[PDB]
């Protein structure tokens, strides 16, 4: 199977607060594994999966120092951005970064990622070529030029192709057994809805990872049905359901399908 690492970083400024709060959260295969929070008593990168306790004090020292650098970086940047957007003192602002790499089943780099958002909106992002930048806003051109003139892309490229892959490989070796998936377990419930009609609700439960698809069909055609957003059980696994309104006494015509990477093939069921 394919793999990935991300680091999701946030800085937030607020009216009263002297200094922005900075949080960095790292992910391997979308499970959180390291975290830094400037609001902590003693701000440091802490392990967030039992398999990271392996890394020795050098690791945590250097990653923590790396964090303190970002904290500065995000802070100066937030200040610059205020100026670029002619925003005055007296508001809240957020600067966000996602960085990382995707590997294929072969463990070779498939894609690097480097993007940033301001006020929850795309500000500037490194293109898939890892050479050029995309930057929508007129304010953002100021940055794009700065970074073009400074060769920023090449140094991020080095990181994404190098350290990111190198250390994900290492985390993946250290972490086997995030390797496994949990298949969904499906059932259907019956609920009255109106006169003449009822509600069939296909539940999927106990699955990891989150990505899953639920469908309903009536003699072979899919439907257009209510679906909830996939939600955490709170125990590492996920839940989803999808529902359709059905005529009374015609419920054995309707079939639910569940699709998930953990399955040997999709599951098929109906109400019983």
């Amino acid at each position: 199977g394919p793999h990935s690492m991300r680091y999701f970083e946030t800085a937030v400024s607020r009216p009263g607060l002297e200094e922005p709060r900075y949080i960095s959260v790292g992910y391997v295969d979308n499970k959180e594994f390291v975290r830094f929070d400037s609001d902590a008593e003693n701000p440091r990168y802490e392990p967030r999966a039992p398999w990271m306790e392996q890394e020795g004090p050098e690791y945590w020292e250097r990653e923590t120092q790396k964090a303190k650098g970002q904290e500065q970086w995000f802070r100066v940047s937030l200040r610059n951005l205020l100026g670029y957007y002619n925003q005055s003192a007296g508001g809240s602002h957020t600067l966000q970064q996602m960085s990382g790499c995707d590997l294929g089943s072969d463990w070779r780099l498939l894609r690097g990622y480097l993007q940033f958002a301001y006020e929850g909106r795309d500000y500037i992002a490194l293109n898939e070529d890892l050479k050029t930048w995309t930057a929508a806003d007129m304010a953002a051109q100021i940055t794009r030029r700065k970074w073009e003139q400074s060769g920023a892309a090449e140094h991020y490229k080095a990181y994404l192709e190098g350290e990111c892959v190198e250390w994900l490989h290492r985390y993946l070796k250290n972490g086997n057994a995030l390797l496994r998936t949990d298949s969904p377990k499906a059932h259907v419930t019956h609920h009255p809805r109106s006169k003449g009609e009822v509600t069939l609700r296909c539940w999927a439960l106990g699955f990891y990872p989150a990505d899953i698809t639920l469908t309903w069909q009536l003699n072979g055609e899919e439907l257009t049905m209510e679906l909830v957003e996939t939600r955490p059980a709170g125990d590492g696994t996920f839940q989803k359901w999808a529902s359709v309104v059905v005529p009374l006494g015609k419920e054995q015509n309707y079939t639910c399908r569940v699709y998930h990477e953990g399955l040997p093939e999709p599951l098929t069921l109906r109400w019983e």
Binding site: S24, G26, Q70, V76, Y123, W147, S150
Partner: peptide, 9 residues
Amino acid sequence: KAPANFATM
């Protein structure tokens, strides 16, 4: 391991 950003915005 986390990125260490270069030029500021």
